[PDB]
Design an enzyme around this catalytic site. Structure first.
Site, PDB file in Angstrom:
ATOM      1  N   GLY A 257       0.816  -1.194   0.000  1.00  0.00           N
ATOM      2  CA  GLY A 257       0.000   0.000   0.000  1.00  0.00           C
ATOM      3  C   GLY A 257       0.853   1.248   0.000  1.00  0.00           C
ATOM      4  O   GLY A 257       0.671   2.142  -0.823  1.00  0.00           O
ATOM      5  N   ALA A 258       1.732   1.340   0.976  1.00  0.00           N
ATOM      6  CA  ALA A 258       2.573   2.481   1.063  1.00  0.00           C
ATOM      7  C   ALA A 258       3.698   2.225   2.053  1.00  0.00           C
ATOM      8  O   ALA A 258       3.720   1.210   2.728  1.00  0.00           O
ATOM      9  CB  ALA A 258       1.772   3.731   1.455  1.00  0.00           C
ATOM     10  N   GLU A 260       6.646   4.084   4.915  1.00  0.00           N
ATOM     11  CA  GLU A 260       6.963   5.242   5.799  1.00  0.00           C
ATOM     12  C   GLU A 260       8.421   5.721   5.762  1.00  0.00           C
ATOM     13  O   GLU A 260       8.953   6.224   6.773  1.00  0.00           O
ATOM     14  CB  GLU A 260       6.587   4.850   7.200  1.00  0.00           C
ATOM     15  N   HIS A 293      -1.672   6.548   8.392  1.00  0.00           N
ATOM     16  CA  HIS A 293      -0.848   5.415   8.816  1.00  0.00           C
ATOM     17  C   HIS A 293       0.648   5.676   8.616  1.00  0.00           C
ATOM     18  O   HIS A 293       1.425   5.549   9.554  1.00  0.00           O
ATOM     19  CB  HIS A 293      -1.295   4.127   8.044  1.00  0.00           C
ATOM     20  N   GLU A 294       1.055   6.051   7.393  1.00  0.00           N
ATOM     21  CA  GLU A 294       2.454   6.236   7.131  1.00  0.00           C
ATOM     22  C   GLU A 294       3.005   7.448   7.910  1.00  0.00           C
ATOM     23  O   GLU A 294       4.117   7.377   8.411  1.00  0.00           O
ATOM     24  CB  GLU A 294       2.795   6.320   5.670  1.00  0.00           C
ATOM     25  N   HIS A 297       3.693   6.414  11.492  1.00  0.00           N
ATOM     26  CA  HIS A 297       4.898   5.660  11.640  1.00  0.00           C
ATOM     27  C   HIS A 297       6.137   6.570  11.952  1.00  0.00           C
ATOM     28  O   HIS A 297       7.149   6.091  12.424  1.00  0.00           O
ATOM     29  CB  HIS A 297       5.241   4.885  10.388  1.00  0.00           C
ATOM     30  N   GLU A 316       3.658  -2.076  13.675  1.00  0.00           N
ATOM     31  CA  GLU A 316       2.446  -2.198  12.850  1.00  0.00           C
ATOM     32  C   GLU A 316       1.123  -2.282  13.640  1.00  0.00           C
ATOM     33  O   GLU A 316       0.141  -1.651  13.257  1.00  0.00           O
ATOM     34  CB  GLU A 316       2.499  -3.330  11.800  1.00  0.00           C
TER      35      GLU A 316
HETATM   36  C1  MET Z   1       6.515  -4.823   3.516  1.00  0.00           C
HETATM   37  S1  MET Z   1       5.870  -3.366   2.672  1.00  0.00           S
HETATM   38  C2  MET Z   1       5.973  -2.104   3.919  1.00  0.00           C
HETATM   39  C3  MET Z   1       4.656  -1.895   4.685  1.00  0.00           C
HETATM   40  C4  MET Z   1       4.648  -0.535   5.409  1.00  0.00           C
HETATM   41  N1  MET Z   1       5.581  -0.563   6.612  1.00  0.00           N
HETATM   42  C5  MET Z   1       3.243  -0.190   5.927  1.00  0.00           C
HETATM   43  O1  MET Z   1       3.072  -0.166   7.151  1.00  0.00           O
HETATM   44  O2  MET Z   1       2.311   0.116   5.148  1.00  0.00           O
HETATM   45 ZN    ZN Z   2       2.539   0.244   8.830  1.00  0.00          ZN
END
Ligand code: MET
Ligand code: ZN
Ligand code: MET
Ligand code: MET
Ligand code: MET
Ligand code: NA
Ligand code: NA
Ligand code: NA
Ligand code: NA
Ligand code: NA
Ligand code: NA
Ligand code: NA
Ligand code: NA
Length: 866
Positions: A257-258, A260, A293-294, A297, A316
């Protein structure tokens, strides 16, 4: 490929404090020069072991001496006989154009970009690619100016210049030490949306959103959501941004998805680009959630990071909790909680009952990219929320504050976080820590007794977690079990015992225990596990009338919804059994009447009404059963929809019409009304055909926004209405050039109930908008077929399985991370009947024999076939 184990963690023999990277960037051949300052912590004879994958090593120097005491081994560069402190210089080559797996440095259209989490940096240079090694980065990027006019990395620009032959360069520095998974690099030609946020203490932050040329018209909502995220984290958690620039780059080719990366987030364009005619209300809310979300983080993940990848939930679970709280505070808390519960009970519970079951802090991992899971994320967040329930907001924030005070600037563990919460609050979380180490979903059984002579209400609560394939032993958890008791008027009965108030969060900590409440002046109707206060299956013998009473009276909106779900469950189960016997749908009149009453209740929030009127998905339905019959479930859901459409036809139409809105706005009250209106349309589509066809076609043609157009289109597909082909062709002709918009159309194709859906789906592998090079397209067509069309995926001829095998045979070599996402439905085989199970096993055995089977698939296949 060898499993790694959490209990084998040991502090690194060497640290790197500072790393100076130079990239001579080119799609075909990029040259990387990495100068690292290293310090030995371990024994003086220990070699430095660097990770590296698919690198062409050019040279190795130690304090500028070309080094001879080294060797390459599988996945590694092992350097011997080193001083205690030294400068390591590696030069190596990589090939971004060849990178189809989209891990490391790769190409997204004409851009170059990175994805380093979890272990992608080792695809860029030889490094200590482990998250307890934190270093200060400086990054110089050299490239063709015409092709790559923007050269971006983490932090701020500290140097720049131009060279001969049309090349230029930019150097970046980020003052915060970081693990390499947070490194990023982007080069390309973009439109840029620029704005500013001023933090509460007055730090001015330049906000920069990079998008492909021509996409600026779809950037403002993401920018708005970024500012919203920054303000909220200040108001709720007292956290401010800590750098001078906040960059976000939207890329079309991205496996997840994205991401950080500090100061330079890289997003799948699906979670950035929105305009009212391209994106639904749900897309807007998802952009909000993911942007937030990002951003969150930055503290929960970047300022405090993870000691090792087994601690993934530390960032997470907590960041997901934060995104949910952000969404819930800004929008409808009820609708947020409902949807997060749907995901838990319908998707995460399935994983916890599968061969891939793991605790939120895993013990054993082969391929770490397989553990970015519903468990780590969603159940993780449910565990954080249990802490919040046990402590209360004020103590929970004290814990956050102690966590950051102790661990800012370092790489911490799940256990560190729990200890901060326990120490700041004085709540004992020793037993609670079992939620980190135990897999599977607990089953909480509740019996009740009312004693009219003493006016006491007794709850007898028991718990157990069944064994899972990874753990043969299970023990009781600390389960916060929230209750509320209602009298015959719907008023709350005060909880008390022996003359003292009793907290409504019961501490269910044993295999079995009793709770007695005094002064219970009327036989109560209980609301149990309020707000889904722990991630458990609840077994209580409800009457229909207790549930309909809760639907009418419960104080929390969530409780009303949840009661409706329990009411439906009974009748979903009944009708699945009836389906297997060849019989028509059966539903008591008083159940239909409960839903009639919701439709007509003017005092109910429309946001809530809409959710009550959205039937459990086929995934949530599947969780109600030990053995899944995917055809029965699909047909039952359709039949229940048709039955309600018939019985409630007049009411449905009336509420559909009452909630019409001529202005489109992206506002929460307006979204709620639309969700109610479109929930009504879903039933209406399945009513009388001619009225349905007219209503659906008109909504699609008159829609001034994608929410309403897609709701109509989706209904035409689900009910197989006469207008369906024409509408689907109109969407294709209008939107074929826009992959994100065509993803919605591929999902409707994939999930179509038509008898020949698989033939149509295979045909779409040649569609002008589809390509196997794009993860979003793969997920929208192939992924959605396998995972959201279980009736067709699980066709009795096995044709579904064979299709997925063929797609995974390609994807295993092309993009193993997307392959592993897509295999998940085959690993559920033990939930199916013998004959299906045998075909699914034969498909897994075919995949097990692929030449060059990826670790990603190997892990899952081996668990499934055990
Ligand atoms: C393993 S792809 C990275 C995911 C990213 N840390 C998120 O929380 O969206
Ligand atoms: Zn995340
Ligand atoms: C929900 S309170 C009633 C419990 C039980 N049916 C009794 O009669 O004691
Ligand atoms: C946003 S999808 C396009 C819908 C538009 N009402 C049409 O008939 O083409
Ligand atoms: C899910 S719409 C039905 C398929 C449509 N007739 C097509 O060929 O594309
Ligand atoms: Na360098
Ligand atoms: Na370090
Ligand atoms: Na302000
Ligand atoms: Na809210
Ligand atoms: Na929903
Ligand atoms: Na009794
Ligand atoms: Na029950
Ligand atoms: Na194509």
């Amino acid at each position: 490929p060898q499993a790694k184990y959490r209990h084998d963690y040991r502090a690194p023999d060497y640290q790197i404090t500072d790393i100076d990277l130079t990239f001579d960037l080119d799609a075909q051949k990029t040259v990387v020069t990495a100068v690292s300052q290293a310090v030995r912590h371990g024994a003086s004879d220990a070699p430095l072991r660097l990770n590296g994958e698919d690198l062409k090593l050019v040279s190795v120097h130690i304090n500028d001496e070309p080094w001879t005491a080294w060797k390459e081994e599988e996945g590694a560069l092992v350097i011997s006989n080193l001083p205690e402190r030294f400068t390591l210089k590696i030069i190596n080559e990589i090939s971004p154009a060849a990178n189809t797996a989209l891990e490391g440095l790769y190409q997204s259209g004409d851009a170059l970009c990175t994805q380093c989490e979890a272990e992608g940096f080792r695809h860029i240079t030889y490094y200590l690619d482990r998250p307890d090694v934190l270093a200060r980065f400086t990054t110089k990027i050299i490239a063709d100016k015409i092709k790559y006019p923007f050269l971006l990395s983490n932090g701020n620009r500290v140097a720049q210049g131009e060279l001969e032959n049309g090349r230029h360069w930019v150097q970046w520095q980020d003052p915060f030490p970081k693990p390499c998974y947070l490194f990023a690099l982007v080069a390309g030609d973009f439109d840029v949306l620029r704005d500013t946020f001023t933090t509460r203490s007055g730090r001015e932050v330049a906000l920069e959103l990079y998008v492909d040329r021509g996409n600026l018209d779809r950037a403002p909502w993401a920018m708005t959501s970024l500012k919203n995220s920054m303000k909220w984290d200040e108001e709720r958690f007292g956290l401010e941004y800590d750098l001078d620039i906040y960059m976000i780059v939207a890329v079309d080719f991205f496996n997840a998805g994205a991401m950080e990366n500090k100061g330079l987030n890289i997003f799948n364009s699906k979670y950035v680009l929105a305009r009212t005619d391209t994106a639904t209300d749900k897309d807007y809310l998802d952009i909000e959630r993911v942007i937030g979300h990002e951003y969150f983080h930055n503290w929960t993940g970047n300022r405090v990071t993870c000691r090792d990848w087994f601690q993934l939930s530390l960032k997470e679970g907590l960041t997901v909790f934060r995104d949910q709280e952000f969404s819930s505070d800004l929008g409808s808390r009820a609708v947020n909680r409902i949807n997060n519960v749907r995901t838990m009970r319908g998707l995460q519970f399935a994983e916890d009952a599968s061969p891939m079951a793991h605790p939120i802090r895993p013990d054993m991992v082969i391929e770490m990219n397989n553990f970015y899971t519903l468990t780590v994320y969603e159940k993780g967040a449910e565990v954080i929320r249990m802490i919040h329930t046990l402590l209360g907001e004020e103590n929970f924030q004290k814990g956050m504050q102690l966590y950051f005070e102790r661990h800012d600037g370092s790489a911490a563990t799940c256990d560190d976080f729990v200890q901060a919460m326990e120490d700041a609050s004085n709540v004992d979380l020793s037993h609670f820590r079992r939620w980190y180490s135990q897999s599977g979903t607990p089953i909480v059984t509740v019996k009740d007794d009312y004693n009219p002579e003493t006016e006491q209400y007794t709850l007898t609560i028991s718990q157990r977690t069944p064994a899972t394939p990874d753990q043969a032993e299970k023990q009781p958890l600390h389960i916060p079990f929230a209750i509320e008791l209602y009298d015959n008027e719907g008023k709350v009965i005060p909880l008390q015992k022996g003359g003292h108030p009793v907290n409504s969060v019961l501490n269910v900590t044993q295999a079995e225990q009793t709770f007695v409440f005094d002064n219970v002046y009327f036989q109560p109707v209980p609301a149990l596990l309020c707000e889904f206060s722990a991630p458990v299956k609840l077994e209580y013998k409800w009457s229909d009338q207790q549930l309909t009473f809760l639907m009418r009276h419960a104080r929390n909106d969530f409780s009303r919804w949840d009661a409706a779900q329990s009411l439906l469950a009974t009748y979903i189960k009944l009708n699945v059994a009836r389906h297997q016997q060849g019989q028509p749908l059966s539903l008591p009149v008083h159940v239909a009447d409960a839903f009639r009453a919701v439709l007509l209740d003017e005092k109910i929030d429309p946001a809530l009404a809409a959710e009550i009127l959205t039937l459990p998905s086929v995934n949530e339905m599947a969780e109600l059963f030990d053995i899944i019959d995917p055809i029965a479930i699909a047909e039952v859901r359709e039949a229940l929809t048709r039955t309600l459409a018939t019985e409630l036809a007049d009411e449905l139409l009336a509420i559909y019409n009452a909630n019409y809105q001529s202005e489109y706005r992206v506002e929460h009250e307006d979204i709620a009304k639309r969700t109610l209106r479109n929930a009504c349309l879903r039933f209406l589509a399945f009513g009388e055909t001619h009225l349905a066809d007219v209503l659906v076609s008109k909504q699609f043609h008159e829609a001034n926004n994608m929410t309403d157009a897609l709701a109509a289109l989706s209904a035409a597909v689900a009910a197989q209405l006469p207008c369906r082909d024409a509408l689907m062709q109109e969407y294709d002709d209008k939107w074929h050039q826009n992959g994100l918009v065509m993803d919605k159309w591929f999902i409707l194709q994939a999930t179509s109930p038509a008898a020949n859906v698989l033939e149509t789906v295979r045909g779409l592998l040649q569609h002008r908008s589809f390509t196997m090079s794009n993860p979003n397209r793969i997920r929208s067509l192939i992924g959605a077929f396998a995972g959201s069309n279980p009736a067709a995926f699980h066709a009795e001829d096995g044709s579904g399985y064979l299709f997925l095998v063929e797609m995974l045979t390609d994807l295993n070599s092309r993009n193993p991370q997307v392959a592993s996402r897509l295999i998940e439905p085959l690993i559920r085989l033990k939930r199916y009947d013998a004959k299906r199970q045998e075909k699914m096993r034969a498909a897994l055995e075919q995949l097990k024999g692929l030449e060059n089977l990826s670790g990603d698939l190997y892990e899952k296949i081996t668990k499934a076939l055990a």
